[PDB]
Amino acid sequence: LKPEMIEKLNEQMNLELYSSLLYQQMSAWCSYHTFEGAAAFLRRHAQEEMTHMQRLFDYLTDTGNLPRINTVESPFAEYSSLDELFQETYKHEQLITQKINELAHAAMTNQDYPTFNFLQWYVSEQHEEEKLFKSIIDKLSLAGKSGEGLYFIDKELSTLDTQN
Amino acid sequence: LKPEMIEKLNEQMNLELYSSLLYQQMSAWCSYHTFEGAAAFLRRHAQEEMTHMQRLFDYLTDTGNLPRINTVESPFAEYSSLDELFQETYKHEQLITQKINELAHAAMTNQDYPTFNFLQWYVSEQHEEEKLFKSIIDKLSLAGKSGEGLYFIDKELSTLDTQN
Amino acid sequence: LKPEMIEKLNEQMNLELYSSLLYQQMSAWCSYHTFEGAAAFLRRHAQEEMTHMQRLFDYLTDTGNLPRINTVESPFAEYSSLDELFQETYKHEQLITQKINELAHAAMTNQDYPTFNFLQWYVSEQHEEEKLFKSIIDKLSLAGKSGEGLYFIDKELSTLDTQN
Amino acid sequence: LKPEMIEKLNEQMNLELYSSLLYQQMSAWCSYHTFEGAAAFLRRHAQEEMTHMQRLFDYLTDTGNLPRINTVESPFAEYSSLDELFQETYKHEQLITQKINELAHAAMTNQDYPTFNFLQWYVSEQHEEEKLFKSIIDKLSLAGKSGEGLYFIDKELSTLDTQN
Amino acid sequence: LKPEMIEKLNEQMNLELYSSLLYQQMSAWCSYHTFEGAAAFLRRHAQEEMTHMQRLFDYLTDTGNLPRINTVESPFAEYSSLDELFQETYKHEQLITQKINELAHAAMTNQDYPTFNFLQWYVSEQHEEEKLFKSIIDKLSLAGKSGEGLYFIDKELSTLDTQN
Amino acid sequence: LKPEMIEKLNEQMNLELYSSLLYQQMSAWCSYHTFEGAAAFLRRHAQEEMTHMQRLFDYLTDTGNLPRINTVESPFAEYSSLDELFQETYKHEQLITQKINELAHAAMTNQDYPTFNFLQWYVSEQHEEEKLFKSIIDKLSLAGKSGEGLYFIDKELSTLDTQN
Amino acid sequence: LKPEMIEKLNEQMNLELYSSLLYQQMSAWCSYHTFEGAAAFLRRHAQEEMTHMQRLFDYLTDTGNLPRINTVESPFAEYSSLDELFQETYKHEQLITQKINELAHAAMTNQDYPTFNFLQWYVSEQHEEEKLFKSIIDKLSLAGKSGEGLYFIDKELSTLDTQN
Ligand SMILES: [Cl-]
Ligand SMILES: [Cl-]
Ligand SMILES: [Cl-]
Ligand SMILES: [Cl-]
Ligand SMILES: [Cl-]
Ligand SMILES: [Cl-]
Ligand SMILES: [Cl-]
Ligand SMILES: [Cl-]
Ligand SMILES: [Cl-]
Ligand SMILES: [Cl-]
Ligand SMILES: [Cl-]
Ligand SMILES: [Cl-]
Ligand SMILES: [Cl-]
Ligand SMILES: [Cl-]
Ligand SMILES: [Cl-]
Ligand SMILES: [Cl-]
Ligand SMILES: [Cl-]
Ligand SMILES: [Cl-]
Ligand SMILES: [Cl-]
Ligand SMILES: [Cl-]
Ligand SMILES: [Cl-]
Ligand SMILES: [Cl-]
Ligand SMILES: [Cl-]
Ligand SMILES: [Cl-]
Ligand SMILES: [Cl-]
Ligand SMILES: [Cl-]
Ligand SMILES: [Cl-]
Ligand SMILES: [Cl-]
Ligand SMILES: [Fe+3]
Ligand SMILES: [Fe+3]
Ligand SMILES: [Fe+3]
Ligand SMILES: [Fe+3]
Ligand SMILES: [Fe+3]
Ligand SMILES: [Fe+3]
Ligand SMILES: [Fe+3]
Ligand SMILES: [Fe+3]
Ligand SMILES: [Fe+3]
Ligand SMILES: [Fe+3]
Ligand SMILES: [Fe+3]
Ligand SMILES: [Fe+3]
Ligand SMILES: [Fe+3]
Ligand SMILES: [Hg+2]
Ligand SMILES: [Hg+2]
Ligand SMILES: [Mg+2]
C-alpha cells in the first residue's frame, strides 16, 4: 500500500472512531433532556460506528500496517433542541460520505484497485446511513410541530434500526 | 450528587474510554509484530472496557448529570517487546485500580453511599483485571525467553478468557 | 470483448492454473522433507487455485470466447528451506495480485465495465491470499529458528484455513 | 446527484419498465403461436424486469429525487418466427447492457462513486442476462432447425431459470 | 369472442397496467414528501394492479386472442397534498369499477356468459378496492386536521393490507 | 323449476354422460393404436365428465325432480389418426360449451337465478376445458408431423392433469 | 522403489494431469459450439482425472519420493465435430490404458509386488473408463445421424456419471 492510502485509510478509521463517540455523547444529551428513545438509538448507532472503525483497523493490519489512533477531539456540544441535534448528525454523516468518496477517488487515481474494492462496502453503507438519518429529520419535520409529537418519534427511535 | 463526585466519576468514565482505545492500539502493535493471539485477546478486552465506560456513562445520566467525553490522548506507542507491552498493560490496570480506590474513598468521606455501592462493581472488576494481566506477565516470564515460547503464549492468548 | 482483454483474461486463467500446480509441487517438496502439515495445507490450496482458474475459464466461455490452456512451465524447484518455499509462495501471490491489478486497470481504460466488475472477485480474493501467505511467513520468522519450532508451525498448517 | 446523472438514471428506469412490457407482449405472441413454454419464460422475465425498474426507482427516491415515469411506447410487434423473436430479445438486452455501461462510465468520470457502486448490481445482472439470452439462441440453432426441434426447446423454455 | 368484447377487454387490460404505473408514480410523490408508509402502500398496490392486468392478459390469450399493450400515457401529476393524492386514487378506482361494470353489461348484452363469468372476479375485487381506498380517505379526514395526525395515518399505511 | 328448464338440465346431464363414454371410447382407440399416454389422459377425463353428470343429476334431485338417463348413442368411431381424434374432442367440448351458454341464457331470460348461479360452475369449467383441449391440438401441430413427435406428446399426455 | 518404477509412476502422474487439462479444454470447445451437456460432462471428468493424478502423487510421497510435475504440453486442438472429439477422448483413454499395462508389466518383471498391487486400482478403473467413453461413442452413433439427436445426447451427458 502506498503511504498516501495507508494514511487516508488510517484517518478515516479515526473519523469512524470520533463518530462513535459523537453519537455516544449525543445520546447523553438526549437522556439529560428526557428523550430516552433517541438516546437508545444513538447508543446502538455508536456501536455500529465502532464496527466501521474496526473494519478499517483490520484492513490496515491485514495489509501489513500498524493502525494509529490519534488524538480524539472532544465531541461535546450544546444543542438547542432534538431537531438541531439530528441536523448535526445527518450533516456529520454527509462529511463521512464525502471523505469516503475522496478515499475512493484517491484509490482510483493511484490505481490501488484493492483499496478501491475494500471501500465499496463503505460507499454502500454510507448510502444506507444517509437514508436512515434523513428519514429521522423527515419524521421530525412531520410529527414534530408540537410537544405531543416529539414524545411519539422518541418512542419510534427506541426500536428504530433493530428489526433483525 | 456532590460536584466533586460528578467530576471524578466523569474522569473515570474517560479513563475507561481511554483504556478501551489503549488496548485496541496495543492490539494493532501485536498484529503488526506477528502476535495474532495477543491481538485477538486485546481486541476482546478493548470491548470490555467500553462496557466499563458505559456503566459510568449510565450512572451519570441516571443521577441527572450530563456525562462529558473529553479529548482522548493518543494511545500510540512503539513498544520494544511483547513483554514491554504487557508490563504497561498491568501498570495501566493498577492505575485504574488506584483511581477506583480513590473514588470509593471520596464516596465514603462525602457520605455518598449510593456511589460507594455503585463503585463496588468496579472494585470487584479490578481485582479480576489485575489477576488476568498479572497471569499474562507471569506466563511470559516463564515460557518465552525465545521465539518458540512467545509462539505458545500467543497460542494461549488467542482463546484466553473466553466465557462458557 | 476487446481482443486485448481476451488475451489477458486468458493469460490470467493460465497463471492461476500454473499456481495450482505450483502449490501441488510445493506440497510434494514439503512431504519429501517431512512437513506433512504444510503439505496438506498446500494441497488444499492447489484445489482453490483450480477454482480461480475455472472461474476465468467460465467467464471466457460465457462471453463467447474459447479459452486456451497453454503450455505449463514445470513448477519443479529444489528449495533450501520451508522458509525459502513460503517466501516464494508469497512472492508468487504478490505477482498474481499485480496481474489482477493490471487486468482491472486495462478494463477501466477500455471502458470494459462488465470485466472490471467480474474481476472484483479476484481483487478481493487476492487481499485474503496475501494475508494468508504473509501470516505464514510471519509464523515462521517467530517460532521456528529450530526443528522444535518448525515442528509446531507444521502442526498449525495441518488444519490452517479450514472452513466452519 | 448531478442533473446529467439524475436524468440518465431516470431514462434507464423507464427502459427497464418498457423491457418488462416488451417481454410481456412477446409472451402473448408466443402463446398465440403455440409456444406456451416460451410464453411462460417470458412471463417470468417480464416480472424480473419490473424488479429492475423498482430498484432504480428506489435509488432515485432514496437520493431525494422524484422519478418520473414517462410515456411508454407500445411494445407491440410482429415476428416472423420464434427464432427471430429471441434474436430481438438478445439485441434488446445488449442495448440495456450498453446503456448500463454508459451509466457506469458517466458515474466514473463525474466521480459519483455512490452511483458507480449502485450500478454494479446491473453490470453484474446484465452479464447473467446476455448469458441467458445467448444460450436460448444457441439452443435454437442446435436443435430447433425443425418442427419437433421447436417443440423441445419450448419444453425447455417452460422451466428455464425457475421463477414460477 | 365478439370483436366489441375483445377490444373492451384489451382496453381494460391496459387500464389496469396504467393503474399500476399511476400508483408506482404516486409512491414517489409520497416518498419525496416524507410519507414512507403511504409510499410503501402504493408500491405494494402497484404490484396488485399488475396482477389484475395479467389476469385479463391470460384470458385474452386463453381465448385465442392476441392482447396488445398500447402506448401508456405518462402517469406524472402534481399534487397539492396527501389528501389530494388519495382523493385521486379513489376517483380512479371508481373509474375502474365503472369500466368493469360496462364490461359486465356488454357481456350480458352480447350473451357472452363465459366473459360475464370471468368478470365476476373483478366485480368483487373492485368492491374490496373501493372499500380499502374509502377507508383511507376516511382515516384521513378523522385523525389528520393537523400535521400531528398525518404522521399516524402514514404509520398505518406502512402495514395496511399486508400481514399476516 | 320451470318445465323447459328441467328438460334442458336433464338434456345436459345426458350430454355429460355421453361425453364420459365418448372419451372412454376414445382412450380405447388410443390403446389399440399404441398411444397409452393419450389413453391414460382420456380415461382420467372420462372420469371427470361423470362428475359433471353427477353434479347435474344432484341438482335435479335436490330441486325435487326426477332425473332421467336417456338412451345413449354409441360413441364408437373409427378415427383416421390421433390428430382427427383430438380435433373431435375439441369440437365436442365446444358443443358442450355452447349448450352451457344456452342453459345460462335460458335461466336469465326466465329469471331462474338459482339455476343461473348453479351453472356458473360449468361456465368456468368449460373455459378450462377449451384451454386444455386446445393446448393439445396445439402440441399436436407443433411436434406431431411425423412418427417421432407422437411419441413425446403421448408421453406428455400420460401425466397431463386437468385440474389446478 | 527402483528408479525405473519411480519414473514410470511419475510419468503416469503427469499423463493423468495432462488428461485433466485435455478434458477441461475439450469442455471449452463443447461450450463454444453450444453442447452444454457435453461440457458439463468433461468438466466433471477433468476433476476425476485430477483425482487419479493425486493418487499417484501420494503413492510416490508415501514411498519416500518427490513427485515431479514436468512441462505440460498445451492440449489445444481443432475438432471437426462432437463425434470426432469423443473419438479422441476414447482414443486417449486407450493410451492411458496401455501405459498402465506397461507399468504393471514393468512392476511384474522387476518383482515390485507393492507397485503391481497399487496399480490394480488403475487397471480396473481404466476398464470402467473405456466402458464409459465407448458407450458415448455408441450413443452418438445411434441417436446422432441428425441435428435433432445431437441435442438429445447432450441432455444425457449433462447428468451422465453422477448418479451417486
Ligand atoms: Cl502508518
Ligand atoms: Cl461528495
Ligand atoms: Cl475536502
Ligand atoms: Cl479535501
Ligand atoms: Cl466495484
Ligand atoms: Cl460487490
Ligand atoms: Cl491502591
Ligand atoms: Cl473476563
Ligand atoms: Cl500492484
Ligand atoms: Cl481460505
Ligand atoms: Cl425506448
Ligand atoms: Cl412523456
Ligand atoms: Cl420492435
Ligand atoms: Cl398480427
Ligand atoms: Cl412458425
Ligand atoms: Cl458496450
Ligand atoms: Cl392526474
Ligand atoms: Cl387486498
Ligand atoms: Cl330414450
Ligand atoms: Cl349423433
Ligand atoms: Cl357459444
Ligand atoms: Cl320479464
Ligand atoms: Cl524422482
Ligand atoms: Cl495394451
Ligand atoms: Cl509403447
Ligand atoms: Cl513403449
Ligand atoms: Cl492382484
Ligand atoms: Cl483387490
Ligand atoms: Fe461509519
Ligand atoms: Fe455512520
Ligand atoms: Fe475498566
Ligand atoms: Fe481493565
Ligand atoms: Fe488464484
Ligand atoms: Fe492464490
Ligand atoms: Fe433484462
Ligand atoms: Fe385493478
Ligand atoms: Fe385497483
Ligand atoms: Fe363436462
Ligand atoms: Fe368436458
Ligand atoms: Fe485417469
Ligand atoms: Fe480417464
Ligand atoms: Hg463491487
Ligand atoms: Hg488384487
Ligand atoms: Mg419482424
Side-chain angles (χ1 to χ4, degrees):
Chain A
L1 287 196
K2 295 168 112 236
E4 185 189 343
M5 299 304 306
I6 288 163
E7 294 297 333
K8 278 197 211 293
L9 290 160
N10 190 79
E11 192 50 30
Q12 186 64 28
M13 176 187 74
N14 276 279
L15 181 58
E16 295 284 349
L17 176 52
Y18 177 89
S19 303
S20 195
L21 302 183
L22 172 66
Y23 300 160
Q24 192 72 52
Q25 177 64 254
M26 280 173 162
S27 93
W29 187 95
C30 284
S31 281
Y32 188 66
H33 285 95
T34 80
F35 309 109
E36 246 30 72
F41 171 69
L42 293 169
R43 174 191 314 136
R44 288 192 299 278
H45 214 254
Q47 222 75 245
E48 270 166 44
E49 299 291 349
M50 272 298 175
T51 277
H52 297 177
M53 185 268 244
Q54 288 163 317
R55 177 182 296 262
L56 281 133
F57 189 104
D58 297 352
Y59 182 75
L60 282 164
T61 71
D62 289 350
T63 56
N65 299 291
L66 186 49
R68 181 184 70 258
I69 297 184
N70 299 317
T71 305
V72 194
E73 294 279 307
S74 177
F76 190 87
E78 291 283 64
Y79 302 112
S80 72
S81 74
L82 187 74
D83 208 82
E84 177 191 334
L85 185 147
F86 283 113
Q87 286 302 329
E88 287 271 287
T89 312
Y90 178 64
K91 190 180 153 196
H92 179 80
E93 279 283 343
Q94 284 176 321
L95 167 78
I96 295 181
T97 294
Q98 188 197 125
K99 284 289 176 167
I100 288 291
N101 293 339
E102 294 182 1
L103 238 159
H105 197 47
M108 192 50 52
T109 305
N110 284 311
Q111 294 165 228
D112 181 357
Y113 296 105
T115 298
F116 183 82
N117 173 292
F118 171 67
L119 290 172
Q120 296 308 303
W121 187 92
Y122 288 85
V123 169
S124 65
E125 252 63 36
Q126 282 308 126
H127 167 92
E128 299 299 328
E129 294 274 77
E130 290 186 350
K131 179 177 177 151
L132 180 71
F133 292 97
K134 200 197 147 216
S135 68
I136 288 168
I137 283 171
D138 288 346
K139 291 189 173 116
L140 279 173
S141 211
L142 205 67
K145 304 175 181 69
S146 52
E148 186 223 301
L150 284 179
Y151 162 92
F152 276 114
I153 302 156
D154 183 77
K155 192 159 114 188
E156 195 142 64
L157 289 166
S158 183
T159 54
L160 187 60
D161 236 18
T162 52
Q163 56 268 173
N164 294 352
Chain B
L1 248 55
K2 294 193 182 184
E4 147 186 25
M5 288 300 326
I6 293 156
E7 187 47 37
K8 273 186 185 206
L9 283 173
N10 202 79
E11 288 159 31
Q12 182 64 27
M13 195 223 86
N14 281 288
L15 174 62
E16 299 282 356
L17 167 58
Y18 171 86
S19 301
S20 202
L21 304 182
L22 180 60
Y23 301 156
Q24 188 80 50
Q25 184 58 251
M26 282 176 167
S27 182
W29 187 100
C30 288
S31 303
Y32 187 50
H33 278 277
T34 78
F35 311 111
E36 297 302 325
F41 167 70
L42 283 158
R43 194 222 267 199
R44 281 198 306 276
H45 221 259
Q47 285 168 284
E48 267 174 64
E49 299 288 355
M50 212 59 234
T51 68
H52 302 175
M53 180 268 220
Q54 171 95 253
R55 169 189 290 269
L56 275 149
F57 206 91
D58 294 351
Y59 182 77
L60 283 167
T61 60
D62 291 347
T63 55
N65 302 283
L66 180 76
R68 187 172 196 146
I69 298 172
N70 293 328
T71 297
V72 189
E73 285 201 49
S74 180
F76 194 68
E78 308 261 53
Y79 303 107
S80 60
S81 21
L82 197 60
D83 207 70
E84 201 212 346
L85 184 151
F86 277 107
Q87 232 67 66
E88 186 168 287
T89 310
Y90 180 61
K91 202 278 227 304
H92 183 69
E93 287 280 339
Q94 291 176 308
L95 169 67
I96 289 167
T97 288
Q98 168 196 139
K99 287 289 166 177
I100 295 297
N101 296 335
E102 278 156 31
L103 247 165
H105 185 47
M108 260 297 140
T109 70
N110 294 356
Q111 294 166 231
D112 185 358
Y113 299 94
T115 301
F116 184 85
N117 173 284
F118 162 72
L119 293 171
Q120 293 318 110
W121 191 93
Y122 289 88
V123 174
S124 194
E125 195 57 31
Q126 286 318 121
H127 161 89
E128 293 313 315
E129 296 289 73
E130 275 185 34
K131 177 190 178 179
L132 181 52
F133 296 95
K134 185 67 218 276
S135 76
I136 282 165
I137 280 160
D138 289 346
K139 273 151 185 62
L140 291 164
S141 41
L142 174 61
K145 303 309 181 199
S146 62
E148 38 273 311
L150 279 180
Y151 175 82
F152 278 114
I153 296 141
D154 184 77
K155 198 114 167 73
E156 200 185 321
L157 297 179
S158 77
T159 53
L160 199 167
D161 197 13
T162 286
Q163 56 66 234
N164 183 204
Chain C
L1 248 55
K2 294 193 182 184
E4 147 186 25
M5 288 300 326
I6 293 156
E7 187 47 37
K8 273 186 185 206
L9 283 173
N10 202 79
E11 288 159 31
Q12 182 64 27
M13 195 223 86
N14 281 288
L15 174 62
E16 299 282 356
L17 167 58
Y18 171 86
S19 301
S20 202
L21 304 182
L22 180 60
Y23 301 156
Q24 188 80 50
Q25 184 58 251
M26 282 176 167
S27 182
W29 187 100
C30 288
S31 303
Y32 187 50
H33 278 277
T34 78
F35 311 111
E36 297 302 325
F41 167 70
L42 283 158
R43 194 222 267 199
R44 281 198 306 276
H45 221 259
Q47 285 168 284
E48 267 174 64
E49 299 288 355
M50 212 59 234
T51 68
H52 302 175
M53 180 268 220
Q54 171 95 253
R55 169 189 290 269
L56 275 149
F57 206 91
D58 294 351
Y59 182 77
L60 283 167
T61 60
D62 291 347
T63 55
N65 302 283
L66 180 76
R68 187 172 196 146
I69 298 172
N70 293 328
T71 297
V72 189
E73 285 201 49
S74 180
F76 194 68
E78 308 261 53
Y79 303 107
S80 60
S81 21
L82 197 60
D83 207 70
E84 201 212 346
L85 184 151
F86 277 107
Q87 232 67 66
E88 186 168 287
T89 310
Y90 180 61
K91 202 278 227 304
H92 183 69
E93 287 280 339
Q94 291 176 308
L95 169 67
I96 289 167
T97 288
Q98 168 196 139
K99 287 289 166 177
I100 295 297
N101 296 335
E102 278 156 31
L103 247 165
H105 185 47
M108 260 297 140
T109 70
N110 294 356
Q111 294 166 231
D112 185 358
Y113 299 94
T115 301
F116 184 85
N117 173 284
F118 162 72
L119 293 171
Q120 293 318 110
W121 191 93
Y122 289 88
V123 174
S124 194
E125 195 57 31
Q126 286 318 121
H127 161 89
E128 293 313 315
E129 296 289 73
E130 275 185 34
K131 177 190 178 179
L132 181 52
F133 296 95
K134 185 67 218 276
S135 76
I136 282 165
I137 280 160
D138 289 346
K139 273 151 185 62
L140 291 164
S141 41
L142 174 61
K145 303 309 181 199
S146 62
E148 38 273 311
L150 279 180
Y151 175 82
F152 278 114
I153 296 141
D154 184 77
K155 198 114 167 73
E156 200 185 321
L157 297 179
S158 77
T159 53
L160 199 167
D161 197 13
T162 286
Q163 56 66 234
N164 183 204
Chain D
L1 268 39
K2 298 190 154 168
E4 130 157 79
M5 277 298 339
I6 292 164
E7 218 45 68
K8 266 162 196 182
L9 285 168
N10 195 88
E11 210 43 55
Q12 190 58 31
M13 202 223 82
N14 279 273
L15 173 66
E16 298 284 339
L17 168 54
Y18 173 83
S19 294
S20 199
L21 297 180
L22 178 57
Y23 301 160
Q24 194 76 61
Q25 188 58 245
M26 289 173 165
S27 78
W29 184 102
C30 284
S31 284
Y32 194 59
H33 282 275
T34 291
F35 314 108
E36 229 55 49
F41 171 73
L42 289 167
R43 225 131 66 213
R44 292 184 306 260
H45 224 268
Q47 237 268 74
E48 281 181 40
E49 222 64 58
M50 203 66 80
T51 78
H52 299 183
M53 180 265 234
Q54 279 145 16
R55 178 175 204 111
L56 279 150
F57 202 92
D58 305 344
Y59 182 71
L60 287 159
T61 68
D62 290 343
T63 47
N65 301 281
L66 181 56
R68 174 179 194 153
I69 295 158
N70 298 326
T71 299
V72 193
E73 266 182 4
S74 166
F76 180 86
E78 313 289 0
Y79 303 106
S80 301
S81 75
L82 192 70
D83 217 282
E84 174 163 46
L85 179 156
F86 277 113
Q87 247 80 297
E88 301 270 289
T89 49
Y90 182 67
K91 254 61 237 135
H92 176 81
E93 286 285 329
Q94 291 176 326
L95 166 69
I96 294 168
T97 296
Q98 180 202 155
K99 291 291 177 186
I100 289 297
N101 296 333
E102 286 163 24
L103 266 159
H105 193 49
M108 251 300 155
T109 73
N110 302 328
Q111 308 164 218
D112 184 0
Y113 295 114
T115 301
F116 183 77
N117 173 291
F118 167 78
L119 290 158
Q120 292 314 298
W121 194 88
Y122 288 87
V123 171
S124 238
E125 184 61 17
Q126 283 313 114
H127 160 89
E128 290 308 317
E129 297 290 75
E130 292 182 2
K131 189 194 180 143
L132 180 65
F133 289 87
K134 180 58 182 191
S135 77
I136 290 166
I137 291 164
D138 284 337
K139 269 155 178 167
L140 283 173
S141 271
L142 163 80
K145 298 182 78 274
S146 37
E148 297 167 35
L150 285 194
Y151 169 87
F152 298 111
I153 302 138
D154 190 73
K155 211 228 201 84
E156 234 156 40
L157 288 173
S158 81
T159 45
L160 193 73
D161 222 28
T162 68
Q163 177 198 152
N164 258 338
Chain E
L1 255 62
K2 280 150 196 179
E4 169 184 352
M5 290 302 317
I6 295 160
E7 189 57 17
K8 282 208 207 296
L9 289 171
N10 198 76
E11 259 308 305
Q12 185 58 36
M13 186 228 92
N14 276 277
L15 171 63
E16 296 293 339
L17 167 61
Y18 177 88
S19 303
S20 190
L21 296 189
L22 182 72
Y23 303 159
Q24 190 82 212
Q25 193 53 243
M26 285 174 166
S27 75
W29 190 98
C30 287
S31 263
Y32 180 72
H33 281 99
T34 69
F35 311 111
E36 300 312 310
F41 168 70
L42 291 169
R43 181 158 55 249
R44 287 187 310 269
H45 216 256
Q47 253 129 233
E48 278 175 59
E49 295 294 353
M50 203 60 50
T51 70
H52 295 185
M53 176 268 223
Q54 253 245 248
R55 171 194 296 266
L56 283 133
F57 204 85
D58 301 342
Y59 181 75
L60 281 161
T61 55
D62 291 352
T63 60
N65 296 281
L66 186 73
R68 184 198 183 106
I69 299 172
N70 294 312
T71 311
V72 187
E73 195 181 336
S74 174
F76 188 92
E78 309 293 12
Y79 307 107
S80 82
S81 45
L82 193 52
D83 106 75
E84 191 197 355
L85 171 143
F86 280 112
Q87 285 307 306
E88 267 272 356
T89 64
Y90 184 57
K91 290 203 230 278
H92 186 250
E93 289 287 331
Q94 287 171 325
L95 169 69
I96 291 172
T97 298
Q98 173 183 256
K99 293 286 164 162
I100 293 286
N101 293 333
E102 294 169 355
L103 263 156
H105 183 56
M108 273 287 144
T109 288
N110 292 355
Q111 293 164 222
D112 184 1
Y113 292 97
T115 311
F116 184 78
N117 175 286
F118 163 73
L119 292 168
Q120 296 308 298
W121 187 92
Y122 288 88
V123 171
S124 58
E125 178 60 38
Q126 286 304 127
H127 169 81
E128 285 301 318
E129 296 283 74
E130 293 199 0
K131 185 191 171 167
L132 176 64
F133 285 95
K134 228 286 166 152
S135 79
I136 284 167
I137 298 300
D138 281 350
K139 283 200 211 86
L140 280 209
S141 253
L142 173 267
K145 293 297 174 212
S146 53
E148 185 229 281
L150 277 188
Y151 171 85
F152 302 108
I153 290 151
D154 178 77
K155 203 165 164 169
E156 212 184 312
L157 264 0
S158 72
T159 58
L160 176 63
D161 216 36
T162 300
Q163 309 296 13
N164 311 329
Chain F
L1 314 186
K2 286 196 183 177
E4 91 164 56
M5 210 71 217
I6 291 157
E7 232 79 356
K8 270 184 233 259
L9 291 162
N10 196 84
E11 284 174 10
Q12 186 63 34
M13 151 204 74
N14 278 278
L15 180 61
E16 303 275 359
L17 171 60
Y18 171 76
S19 296
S20 196
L21 297 206
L22 177 68
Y23 301 152
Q24 194 71 59
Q25 178 64 258
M26 282 166 173
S27 76
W29 190 95
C30 284
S31 268
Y32 181 52
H33 284 267
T34 78
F35 304 116
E36 298 300 326
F41 172 73
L42 289 162
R43 180 166 77 248
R44 283 191 303 270
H45 214 265
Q47 272 145 29
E48 283 175 50
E49 300 292 342
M50 216 66 259
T51 66
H52 303 181
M53 181 273 215
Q54 289 159 349
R55 166 169 223 137
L56 280 140
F57 206 91
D58 295 358
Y59 182 72
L60 280 162
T61 66
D62 293 353
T63 50
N65 304 280
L66 180 75
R68 178 196 222 96
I69 290 158
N70 296 316
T71 300
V72 195
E73 292 201 21
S74 169
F76 189 79
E78 287 199 316
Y79 306 98
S80 67
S81 69
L82 191 47
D83 195 88
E84 202 211 307
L85 183 154
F86 274 119
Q87 293 301 332
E88 291 267 328
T89 65
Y90 182 64
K91 311 265 190 304
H92 185 77
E93 288 281 334
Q94 282 175 144
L95 175 75
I96 287 169
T97 299
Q98 190 212 307
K99 290 280 169 208
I100 293 299
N101 296 337
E102 293 175 358
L103 253 166
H105 185 52
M108 253 304 137
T109 269
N110 302 149
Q111 271 100 293
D112 182 7
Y113 298 99
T115 301
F116 182 75
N117 172 283
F118 167 74
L119 300 165
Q120 288 314 299
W121 185 94
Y122 286 90
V123 178
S124 35
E125 261 285 319
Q126 284 309 117
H127 176 80
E128 287 303 295
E129 299 281 274
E130 292 190 7
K131 178 179 167 138
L132 168 66
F133 285 90
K134 236 302 189 140
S135 76
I136 288 163
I137 281 171
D138 279 357
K139 285 170 200 303
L140 289 165
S141 39
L142 184 68
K145 281 68 184 75
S146 61
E148 298 74 28
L150 288 159
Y151 177 93
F152 293 102
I153 284 161
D154 181 63
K155 209 63 62 184
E156 227 191 282
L157 288 162
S158 93
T159 60
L160 184 59
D161 290 357
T162 299
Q163 58 192 259
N164 198 160
Chain G
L1 287 196
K2 295 168 112 236
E4 185 189 343
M5 299 304 306
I6 288 163
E7 294 297 333
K8 278 197 211 293
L9 290 160
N10 190 79
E11 192 50 30
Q12 186 64 28
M13 176 187 74
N14 276 279
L15 181 58
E16 295 284 349
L17 176 52
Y18 177 89
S19 303
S20 195
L21 302 183
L22 172 66
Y23 300 160
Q24 192 72 52
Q25 177 64 254
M26 280 173 162
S27 93
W29 187 95
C30 284
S31 281
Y32 188 66
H33 285 95
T34 80
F35 309 109
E36 246 30 72
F41 171 69
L42 293 169
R43 174 191 314 136
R44 288 192 299 278
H45 214 254
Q47 222 75 245
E48 270 166 44
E49 299 291 349
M50 272 298 175
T51 277
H52 297 177
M53 185 268 244
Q54 288 163 317
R55 177 182 296 262
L56 281 133
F57 189 104
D58 297 352
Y59 182 75
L60 282 164
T61 71
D62 289 350
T63 56
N65 299 291
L66 186 49
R68 181 184 70 258
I69 297 184
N70 299 317
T71 305
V72 194
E73 294 279 307
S74 177
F76 190 87
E78 291 283 64
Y79 302 112
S80 72
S81 74
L82 187 74
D83 208 82
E84 177 191 334
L85 185 147
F86 283 113
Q87 286 302 329
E88 287 271 287
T89 312
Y90 178 64
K91 190 180 153 196
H92 179 80
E93 279 283 343
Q94 284 176 321
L95 167 78
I96 295 181
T97 294
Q98 188 197 125
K99 284 289 176 167
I100 288 291
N101 293 339
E102 294 182 1
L103 238 159
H105 197 47
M108 192 50 52
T109 305
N110 284 311
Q111 294 165 228
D112 181 357
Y113 296 105
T115 298
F116 183 82
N117 173 292
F118 171 67
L119 290 172
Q120 296 308 303
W121 187 92
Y122 288 85
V123 169
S124 65
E125 252 63 36
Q126 282 308 126
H127 167 92
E128 299 299 328
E129 294 274 77
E130 290 186 350
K131 179 177 177 151
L132 180 71
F133 292 97
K134 200 197 147 216
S135 68
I136 288 168
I137 283 171
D138 288 346
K139 291 189 173 116
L140 279 173
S141 211
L142 205 67
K145 304 175 181 69
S146 52
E148 186 223 301
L150 284 179
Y151 162 92
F152 276 114
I153 302 156
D154 183 77
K155 192 159 114 188
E156 195 142 64
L157 289 166
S158 183
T159 54
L160 187 60
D161 236 18
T162 52
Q163 56 268 173
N164 294 352

